[PDB]
Design a binder for these strands. Structure first.
Ligand SMILES: [Mg+2]
Ligand SMILES: [Mg+2]
Length: 132
RNA sequence: UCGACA
DNA sequence: ATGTCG
């Protein structure tokens, strides 16, 4: 039940919170579609969030109806609810990560999309293809 | 309390 | 250990 005609996104971080990054790829070819420039500091869940919303953008501007695979239970939800509920403090250091996270919001609720966002069954299918 | 996904 | 959710 793996829909290979999809986009699988995942985040790679160093410490949580800390240096964060994500990337989307073709669930099958493993081809790297979009990659995020390593952010200074940010939580994992925010990483996931952005990873998804970015992929959401990527598709819409290519007119793709491919669903999205994320193993972030927290983000898949945040996104469904168009609301990132991150408890990370807002200070000049968590600037960029919060800047982005907000724009991802300003987008979610100012756009349309039927793009399915699906949970990747890591326990049954192994690490997601966009994994580091 | 724990459980779950990262 | 921390980030989040149920
Ligand atoms: Mg992940
Ligand atoms: Mg991973």
């Amino acid at each position: 039940e793996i829909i290979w005609e999809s986009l699988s996104v995942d985040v790679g971080s160093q410490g949580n919170p800390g240096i964060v990054e994500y990337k989307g790829v073709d669930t099958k070819t493993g081809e790297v579609l979009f990659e995020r420039e390593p952010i200074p500091i940010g939580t994992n869940n925010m990483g996931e969030f952005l990873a998804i919303v970015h992929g959401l953008r990527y598709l819409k501007e290519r007119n793709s109806r491919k669903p999205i695979y994320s193993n972030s239970q927290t983000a898949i939800k945040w996104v469904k609810d168009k609301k990132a509920k991150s408890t990370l403090v807002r200070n000049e250091e968590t600037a960029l990560i919060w800047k982005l996270v907000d724009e991802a919001e300003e987008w979610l609720n100012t756009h349309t999309y039927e793009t399915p966002i699906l949970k990747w069954q890591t326990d049954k299918w192994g690490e997601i293809k966009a994994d580091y």
